[PDB]
Design a protein around this ligand. Structure first.
Ligand SMILES: CN(C)CCCn1cc(C2=C(c3c[nH]c4ccccc34)C(=O)NC2=O)c2ccccc21
Lengths: 274, 7
């Protein structure tokens, strides 16, 4: 059974990740999101614990969906003859971090700090589960506005985490690191930290720093809004040209700008309910 | 000129 268990609503959107619909689970009105993808269009595949051929995305979501976290969890999935259907958590009410920033402009540092910490935990969770997301960006982060909680989405560019080099990538070019641009080579964590540097700038300035390849490889970070010296230093650290000069997750979360983070409910009361 | 960026 599929269209019995889940009542399907309006299309939420569609693109490189397939077609995603609003839905409600009928056994308990749980809000969900239903994501379809054609087998013809899947570029990457894996094998489940059952040992079955599945899109890599299912493999990765299953590894990170154990326990609670800052990731949007996979509740279920069906295979169809020409497609796969994934049933996913949906917060309600929700807005993605890309629209939130467009509507509100550059975020206050205290709020940027709360969001960015939550994204850092969510990514740490992924890495601990052997998953590398490879498309961290504002558009792949949802805000649960009531709870003040950020959740990661879209594992369709992801890979298994490994310590050797990656020579394939197909996430968002503007969040991709200079060693991808110049050599079609990168290592997982160091690339992730670059993306997070781009994300932090996006949060505190209102937009990403670089649009063009030449800008990505030049690593000159002009700040277009007032941003504290501590935050500027963290961002420039994340955006070091040489991968090995970038900070680890630990150095980031121990950086002085990162201290005294608000709790998620505090973040909601102060910055989201009003 | 702010905008989304697909994969
Ligand atoms: C809107 N863009 C550009 C990217 C959204 C990508 N995206 C959102 C979602 C999800 C949700 C969405 C929440 N808002 C959305 C708008 C468009 C598409 C999906 C959503 C959601 O509530 N739970 C989700 O997993 C998603 C799921 C699998 C693959 C990609 C997904």
């Amino acid at each position: 059974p599929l269209e019995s268990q889940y009542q399907v609503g309006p299309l939420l959107g569609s693109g490189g990740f397939g077609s995603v619909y609003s839905g409600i689970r009928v056994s308990d009105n749980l809000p969900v999101a239903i994501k379809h993808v054609e087998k013809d269009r899947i570029s990457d595949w894996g094998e489940l614990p059952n040992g079955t051929r599945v899109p890599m995305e299912v493999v990765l979501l299953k590894k990170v969906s154990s326990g609670f976290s800052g990731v949007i969890r996979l509740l279920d999935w069906f295979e169809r003859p020409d497609s796969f259907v994934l049933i996913l958590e949906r917060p309600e009410p929700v807005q993605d971090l890309f629209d939130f920033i467009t509507e509100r402009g550059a975020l206050q540092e205290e709020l940027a700090r709360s969001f960015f910490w939550q994204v850092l935990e969510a990514v740490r969770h992924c890495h601990n589960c052997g998953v590398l997301h490879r498309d961290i960006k504002d558009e792949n982060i949802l805000i649960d506005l009531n709870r003040g909680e950020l959740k990661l989405i879209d594992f369709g560019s992801g890979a298994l985490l490994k310590d050797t080099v990656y020579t394939d990538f197909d996430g968002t070019r503007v969040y991709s690191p200079p060693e991808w641009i110049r050599y079609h080579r990168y290592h997982g964590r160091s690339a992730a930290v670059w993306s997070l540097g781009i994300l932090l700038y996006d949060m505190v300035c209102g937009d990403i720093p670089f649009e063009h390849d030449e800008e990505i490889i030049g690593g000159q970070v002009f700040f277009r809004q007032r941003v504290s010296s501590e935050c500027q230093h963290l961002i420039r650290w994340c955006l070091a040209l040489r991968p090995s000069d970038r900070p680890t997750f630990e150095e980031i979360q121990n950086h002085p700008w990162m201290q005294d983070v608000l709790l998620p409910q505090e973040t909601a009361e102060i910055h989201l309910h009003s | 000129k702010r905008r989304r960026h697909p994969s």
